[PDB]
XYZ file of C-alpha atoms in Angstrom:
330
model
C 82.066 116.642 113.683
C 85.156 114.527 112.433
C 86.105 111.049 110.818
C 89.417 108.731 110.881
C 89.718 106.210 108.888
C 92.646 103.689 108.466
C 94.729 104.056 105.448
C 96.367 101.220 103.755
C 99.579 100.759 101.926
C 98.345 98.481 98.722
C 101.411 97.014 98.347
C 105.021 95.833 99.700
C 106.434 98.604 98.318
C 104.216 101.475 99.765
C 103.113 102.123 95.811
C 100.181 104.186 97.463
C 97.200 103.835 99.606
C 93.935 103.073 99.755
C 90.654 103.453 102.352
C 87.426 102.324 103.261
C 84.737 104.901 101.850
C 80.767 103.917 101.805
C 78.758 105.193 99.042
C 75.196 105.304 98.749
C 72.424 103.747 100.916
C 72.866 100.359 102.478
C 76.521 101.414 102.663
C 78.378 100.654 99.208
C 81.943 100.168 100.652
C 84.685 100.873 98.026
C 88.547 101.529 99.034
C 89.532 104.948 97.551
C 93.175 106.402 96.726
C 92.872 109.810 98.848
C 95.077 112.299 96.686
C 95.385 115.685 97.957
C 97.096 116.510 94.003
C 93.288 116.226 92.463
C 89.930 117.225 92.963
C 87.225 113.717 91.385
C 86.348 111.525 93.475
C 85.842 108.999 91.082
C 84.849 105.589 90.904
C 84.861 102.090 89.556
C 81.052 101.693 88.856
C 78.352 99.298 87.127
C 79.052 101.579 84.043
C 82.228 101.384 83.949
C 83.385 99.678 80.503
C 83.423 94.966 81.529
C 86.310 94.797 79.933
C 88.103 97.102 82.298
C 87.068 96.297 84.965
C 89.354 93.618 86.477
C 88.826 92.639 90.974
C 88.301 95.927 91.923
C 84.667 96.668 93.935
C 82.161 99.072 91.831
C 79.535 101.350 93.269
C 76.156 100.438 91.875
C 73.679 103.671 91.685
C 70.808 102.108 90.951
C 71.505 100.020 93.947
C 71.676 103.009 96.793
C 67.999 104.423 97.257
C 70.048 108.178 98.419
C 71.081 108.275 94.194
C 70.941 111.034 91.928
C 71.710 111.510 88.249
C 73.282 114.278 88.145
C 71.692 115.543 84.708
C 74.426 116.588 82.035
C 77.276 116.402 83.847
C 80.529 114.994 82.916
C 84.091 114.424 84.014
C 87.184 113.602 82.738
C 90.501 113.524 83.776
C 94.464 112.454 82.820
C 96.951 112.444 86.167
C 100.427 113.565 86.337
C 101.856 109.702 85.354
C 99.395 109.772 82.504
C 96.366 107.850 82.911
C 93.460 108.989 82.414
C 89.603 107.948 83.184
C 86.099 109.126 82.376
C 81.861 109.507 82.805
C 79.307 110.734 84.721
C 77.751 112.029 88.193
C 75.547 110.956 90.489
C 74.872 112.855 94.062
C 74.557 110.173 96.832
C 76.380 110.000 100.166
C 79.476 109.584 101.110
C 80.924 108.574 104.523
C 84.938 108.731 105.586
C 85.628 106.734 109.371
C 82.298 107.737 110.814
C 82.356 111.599 108.906
C 79.166 111.913 106.049
C 78.180 114.127 103.798
C 74.797 114.172 101.627
C 74.975 116.144 98.357
C 78.950 114.207 97.658
C 79.357 114.029 93.489
C 79.813 110.630 93.244
C 81.544 110.588 89.813
C 80.921 106.578 87.812
C 83.945 105.989 85.982
C 82.508 104.818 81.983
C 86.558 104.217 81.185
C 89.085 104.055 82.619
C 92.882 103.602 81.174
C 94.679 100.590 81.811
C 97.476 101.238 84.456
C 93.064 101.465 86.641
C 91.983 98.098 85.846
C 95.806 96.482 86.024
C 95.245 97.454 89.851
C 92.735 95.460 91.360
C 93.550 97.669 94.935
C 92.646 100.641 93.779
C 88.135 101.021 93.344
C 88.892 104.858 92.925
C 90.140 108.325 93.807
C 88.913 110.643 96.517
C 90.393 113.490 95.927
C 91.501 116.386 98.477
C 93.293 119.737 96.509
C 91.326 122.840 95.882
C 87.813 122.718 93.624
C 88.582 124.471 91.153
C 90.723 121.400 89.838
C 87.755 119.237 89.618
C 86.233 118.316 85.938
C 82.810 118.059 86.481
C 81.097 119.975 83.189
C 79.298 122.154 83.020
C 78.758 122.384 86.380
C 82.289 121.909 88.944
C 81.276 119.783 92.376
C 83.540 119.825 95.247
C 85.244 117.912 97.152
C 84.518 115.951 99.922
C 87.049 117.742 102.159
C 84.987 121.275 100.576
C 81.225 119.590 101.518
C 82.273 118.458 104.874
C 84.186 121.593 106.427
C 81.628 123.178 107.951
C 80.214 121.094 109.828
C 84.134 119.513 110.788
C 84.917 120.580 114.673
C 88.473 122.503 112.851
C 88.315 122.880 109.291
C 91.066 120.775 108.543
C 92.442 117.177 107.600
C 95.598 115.469 108.271
C 97.218 112.423 106.983
C 99.816 110.222 108.797
C 101.001 107.094 105.963
C 102.822 105.145 106.897
C 105.993 102.795 105.826
C 105.210 99.443 105.630
C 102.027 99.210 107.875
C 98.943 101.481 108.767
C 98.007 104.837 108.238
C 95.063 106.880 109.059
C 93.688 110.251 107.337
C 91.395 112.218 110.160
C 89.144 115.002 109.127
C 88.598 117.432 111.455
C 90.424 117.685 114.395
C 94.702 117.551 114.912
C 95.397 114.079 116.821
C 98.107 115.489 119.148
C 99.331 111.723 120.339
C 100.041 110.936 117.245
C 103.768 113.016 116.984
C 106.187 114.043 118.207
C 106.958 117.743 118.750
C 105.653 120.355 117.142
C 103.574 121.408 114.149
C 105.234 123.856 112.099
C 103.042 126.038 109.554
C 104.003 126.680 106.807
C 101.838 128.920 103.695
C 100.495 127.564 100.744
C 99.714 129.122 97.322
C 96.300 127.830 96.210
C 96.717 129.398 92.838
C 97.470 125.983 90.598
C 95.224 124.283 92.951
C 97.330 121.933 94.752
C 98.084 121.957 98.148
C 101.329 124.272 96.940
C 104.453 125.152 99.317
C 107.544 125.864 99.602
C 110.326 123.529 101.214
C 112.686 125.577 103.230
C 115.918 123.317 101.694
C 117.489 120.132 102.144
C 120.099 117.297 103.728
C 121.896 114.921 102.286
C 121.899 112.144 104.943
C 124.532 112.978 107.713
C 125.309 116.291 105.480
C 125.219 120.013 106.057
C 121.695 121.120 105.564
C 121.434 123.477 101.945
C 119.539 126.440 102.671
C 117.163 126.849 98.993
C 113.363 127.498 98.104
C 111.796 124.631 96.923
C 108.356 125.545 95.625
C 106.261 121.893 95.655
C 103.454 120.446 96.110
C 102.152 117.928 98.723
C 100.409 114.923 96.838
C 99.079 111.822 98.571
C 98.480 109.596 95.348
C 102.521 110.224 94.149
C 104.299 108.000 95.181
C 107.702 108.735 95.385
C 109.285 112.313 95.952
C 109.869 115.210 93.030
C 112.849 117.469 92.824
C 114.951 119.858 90.928
C 117.572 118.213 90.021
C 120.689 119.633 91.417
C 118.890 118.540 94.756
C 118.114 114.827 93.041
C 121.665 114.443 91.848
C 123.659 115.525 95.635
C 121.415 113.259 96.359
C 122.138 109.625 94.365
C 125.733 110.658 94.276
C 126.090 109.693 97.893
C 125.342 106.079 96.637
C 128.127 103.584 95.407
C 126.848 102.445 92.288
C 123.286 104.800 91.619
C 123.449 106.392 88.176
C 120.199 107.467 86.133
C 118.538 104.835 83.508
C 116.997 106.861 80.818
C 116.182 103.164 79.932
C 114.198 102.804 83.002
C 113.666 106.061 83.473
C 115.149 107.361 86.070
C 117.978 107.068 89.059
C 118.464 103.515 89.789
C 120.815 101.400 92.373
C 122.789 98.913 93.529
C 120.034 96.496 95.845
C 122.523 95.564 98.319
C 123.118 99.591 98.481
C 122.362 101.424 102.304
C 120.601 104.486 101.203
C 121.654 107.898 103.111
C 118.067 109.637 104.582
C 116.993 112.940 102.988
C 116.567 116.104 105.019
C 113.445 118.586 103.942
C 113.532 121.712 104.988
C 110.019 123.272 106.590
C 110.877 126.618 107.787
C 113.445 126.081 110.500
C 111.830 122.880 111.280
C 114.017 119.825 109.607
C 112.066 116.104 108.388
C 114.154 113.116 107.796
C 113.521 110.742 105.635
C 115.022 107.288 106.327
C 117.391 105.968 103.931
C 114.934 102.677 103.110
C 112.150 104.497 102.879
C 113.890 105.940 99.418
C 114.597 102.300 98.184
C 111.460 101.230 95.342
C 113.377 97.160 94.873
C 113.236 95.390 92.229
C 113.617 97.434 88.416
C 111.885 94.475 87.824
C 111.360 90.583 89.150
C 114.623 89.318 90.006
C 116.856 92.107 88.849
C 119.478 93.417 91.373
C 119.099 96.672 89.663
C 116.440 98.598 92.256
C 113.813 102.257 91.360
C 114.909 104.944 93.867
C 112.574 107.268 95.311
C 113.876 110.454 95.038
C 113.599 111.324 91.162
C 113.736 114.896 89.403
C 111.288 116.902 88.455
C 113.017 117.964 85.936
C 110.330 117.771 82.214
C 106.912 116.951 85.139
C 107.788 121.719 85.878
C 106.673 121.170 89.543
C 108.543 119.592 92.497
C 106.342 117.158 94.338
C 106.289 115.730 98.216
C 105.211 112.500 97.654
C 104.091 109.959 99.328
C 107.817 109.227 100.795
C 108.070 112.193 101.817
C 104.799 112.474 103.322
C 105.357 108.831 105.002
C 107.746 110.328 107.490
C 105.880 114.216 108.295
C 102.049 113.986 110.574
C 100.612 116.474 108.001
C 98.396 118.668 108.533
C 95.885 120.261 105.431
C 94.611 123.258 106.665
C 91.855 124.642 105.096
C 91.396 127.793 106.759
C 90.142 130.764 104.934
C 93.490 131.352 104.642
C 95.147 127.740 103.678
C 98.254 126.669 105.939
C 100.239 123.362 105.234
C 101.413 121.634 108.767
C 104.481 118.784 109.169
C 105.771 116.978 112.663
C 107.996 114.154 112.722
C 106.687 111.212 114.556
């Protein structure tokens, strides 16, 4: 089997991407944030505290003839951005772009933190990291991909995120028309539960490539590109007027600037992030100071190849017995 679904930016900045997901019988379609940095499929629901729901579409398990309460199971998660959510668990039928899993754990939110409430466009998350990170207790549950894997034509999914435009998540096959040149595969460590890999270096604009190992994770659920302070300093030094602002919480730059591209290495291959991808607009409405899309990972504890990086590539998440990551230009 295979599946294919369109993923759409939630706003004009590509702050995140939503993908329609069918849950239950009859189908209830929710728009979920596909997140290769976490491993819980959780949704706004009929059980979510009413004051914490503000425009989201909810899953109502009582209206699904295939929903079954997973007795005694709870979940609770906290994300890198400080947000969180928690609740109980159902199993139900879940379909993504034509691909169907029966008995998928659907984590129903009883509580969500304010940032989720405040975002009307995201109805929940669909985690695609390794199932070892799943937070369901006392019996850990598998991700949608993990459940689907055996049935897929090939044990892979691909992320093809758009810049200010729709893109595609495919399950079970590689669309060879969706990228240019070749896919370069690179090793993955699953030891922390992430799609963790090592970039071979970087360049700033038309500058010379610096060969240096950068360990980080491929994370569709993170907006920006978080890299070591040395790398980030080298990038923003090429932008007149750019500075790190403690009050804003990262590098800012004059909105009148033209940003240089940023290249990262995948083995001997190179992925080029156009400068425009690195502009995340005014820090506040009407400001002429703009927020940068490349930021320091210092104090995160890990480098993160988030959407800014991933949307410059066609990315293969290869879930073979030994997982690997593939990157192609597009």
